[PDB]
Amino acid sequence: VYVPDEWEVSREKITLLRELGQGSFGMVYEGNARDIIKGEAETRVAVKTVNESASLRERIEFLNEASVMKGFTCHHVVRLLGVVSKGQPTLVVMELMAHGDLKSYLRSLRPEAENNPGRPPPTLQEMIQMAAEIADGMAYLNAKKFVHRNLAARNCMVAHDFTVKIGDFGMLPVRWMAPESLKDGVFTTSSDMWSFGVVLWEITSLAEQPYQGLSNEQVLKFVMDGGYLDQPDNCPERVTDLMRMCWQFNPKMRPTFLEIVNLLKDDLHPSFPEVSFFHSEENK
Numbered sequence: 634v635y636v637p638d639e640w641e642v643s644r645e646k647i648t649l650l651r652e653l654g655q656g657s658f659g660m661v662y663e664g665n666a667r668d669i670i671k672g673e674a675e676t677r678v679a680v681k682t683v684n685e686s687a688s689l690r691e692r693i694e695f696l697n698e699a700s701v702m703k704g705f706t707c708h709h710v711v712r713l714l715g716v717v718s719k720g721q722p723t724l725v726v727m728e729l730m731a732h733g734d735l736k737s738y739l740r741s742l743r744p745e746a747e748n749n750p751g752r753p754p755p756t757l758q759e760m761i762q763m764a765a766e767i768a769d770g771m772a773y774l775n776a777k778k779f780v781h782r783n784l785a786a787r788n789c790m791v792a793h794d795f796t797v798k799i800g801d802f803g804m805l806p807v808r809w810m811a812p813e814s815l816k817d818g819v820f821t822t823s824s825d826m827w828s829f830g831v832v833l834w835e836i837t838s839l840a841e842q843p844y845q846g847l848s849n850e851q852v853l854k855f856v857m858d859g860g861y862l863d864q865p866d867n868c869p870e871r872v873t874d875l876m877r878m879c880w881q882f883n884p885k886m887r888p889t890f891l892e893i894v895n896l897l898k899d900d901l902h903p904s905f906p907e908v909s910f911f912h913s914e915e916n917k
């Protein structure tokens with residue numbers, strides 16, 4: 634049972650512009666929110682909805698996810714801005730990530746891409762920046778005692794200034810799963826580290842399908858036998874080294890998300906210590 638609180642916004646303050654794509658509970662829209670953030674007259678938003686066919690229990694669960702998001706204040710995790718519980722349909726207002734999911738964004742930077750924005754593919758500097766941003770958001774989730782369980786490029790988001798953030802998470806994708814998860818169903822921050830390595834592989838391959846040519850049955854056998862992804866053509870050695878650390882068979886040998894940020898801290902944008910969880914007073 635959900636009880637309305639301080640975060641609640643009036644229904645008519647949100648104007649929906651267009652559909653973005655299907656979410657877990659229903660359709661996600663691109664919208665504009667009137668006076669949602671202090672100092673901002675209008676804010677570009679992503680509005681999560683519950684579809685008509687869903688149950689009251691499913692509608693309550695959606696609002697309980699919004700209650701959880703209230704305590705999340707990381708710059709590298711997509712933030713909740715407000716909620717609408719009174720009436721029908723149920724709404725959850727998130728910050729808009731202007732360039733959408735990381736997978737779709739990486740595919741658009743390919744030479745053959747019909748929707749190429751006239752920009753080059755990610756530079757080594759940009760790849761390292763993305764890696765640290767994803768790892769910082771994941772370090773924040775881990776400090777919050779949450780295991781993602783579904784980390785992949787399709788789940789990471791790109792902001793207007795190209796900042797990468799963790800989208801929706803765990804409050805089968807066999808090609809991103811750690812050997813212990815494929816075998817025993819064990820999901821931890823260490824299995825999330827394995828998936829992070831696959832995300833790095835997606836960045837360097839411009840969102841190619843992992844283990845292309847191998848079926849879901851062959852991926853399961855290959856990964857559990859100690860097999861891992863081959864490095865993509867012209868992959869920078871620094872990113873390859875990160876992938877290898879992520880792909881250790883024993884989850885105990887894999888680095889932590891904070892250790893990843895610590896390995897990359899010196900080669901980042903000057904704003905990183907001003908916005909990161911790693912450099913915040915919360916990282917203790």
Ligand SMILES: COCCN1CCN(CCn2ccc(Nc3ncc4c(n3)-c3c(nn(C)c3-c3ccccc3)C[C@H]4C)n2)CC1
Binds near residue numbers: 661679727730790800
């Ligand atoms: C040159 O390329 C062509 C131009 N492109 C066209 C596509 N354009 C990009 C469009 N875009 C999609 C989405 C989103 N921005 C966005 N911000 C925030 C969210 C979501 N989307 C979101 C949410 N749940 N779900 C499920 C999604 C979702 C993801 C991918 C696709 C659909 C929906 C909730 C929060 C996390 N922005 C970027 C510019």
